[PDB]
């Protein structure tokens, strides 16, 4: 009992900057700082933007603010707290069945708005800051116009699928792969987030 350890907090380590004409990844914290911040849960950095890059001790992935909640995947974050200026913040939503977790959006973040367009031409924002067209194929599936190796999509779970008007259509969670080639993606539709919130 005396030597039992605790899991650290999820730590924001950067963002996918979508503020201008060019999408690009920015790092805001390096490895040592990330490790320290994960243990204290105290992160005094100013947060900006809609899509954060987040890390645990073992994975780096994405998290997206939609309607004042910072959302990511359960398979990345588990039940972990997130580091914040006031210390660790407990999850507000946890749903292993949807592969979905959420925390109150950090002050300074900007939130996307859920899509009401009912459109099927979508765009996936990756951890490498590419914006890839995705044709919607079902409630939770879309096809990549150009296939990619799965290596390329690893670390992008928690990132958004957007409509042409820039609304949030879903949260990316898993590649649909054959022999290492992703031709499609599985995502959590924004309507499922909306149900969770209401």
């Amino acid at each position: 009992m005396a030597s039992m350890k605790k899991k650290g907090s999820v730590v924001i380590v950067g963002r996918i900057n979508l503020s201008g004409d060019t999408a690009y990844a920015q790092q805001t914290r390096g490895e040592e700082g990330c490790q320290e911040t994960s243990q204290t849960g105290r992160d005094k950095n100013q947060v900006e933007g809609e899509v954060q890059i987040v890390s645990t001790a073992t994975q780096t992935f994405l998290a997206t603010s939609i309607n004042g909640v910072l959302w990511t995947v359960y398979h990345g974050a588990g039940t972990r707290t997130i580091a914040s200026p006031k210390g660790p913040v407990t999850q507000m939503y946890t749903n292993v069945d949807k592969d979905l977790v959420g925390w109150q959006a950090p002050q300074g973040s900007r939130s996307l708005t859920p899509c009401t367009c009912g459109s099927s031409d979508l765009y996936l924002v990756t951890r490498h800051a590419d914006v890839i067209p995705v044709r919607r194929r079902g409630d939770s599936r879309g096809s990549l116009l150009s296939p990619r190796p799965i290596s390329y999509l690893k670390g992008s779970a928690g990132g958004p699928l957007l409509c042409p008007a820039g609304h949030a259509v879903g949260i990316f969670r898993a590649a649909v792969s054959t022999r290492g080639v992703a031709k499609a993606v599985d995502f959590i539709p924004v309507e499922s987030l909306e149900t969770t919130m209401r």
Partner: peptide, 7 residues
Amino acid sequence: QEREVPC
């Protein structure tokens, strides 16, 4: 066969 790979 296609499989889901969590990312």
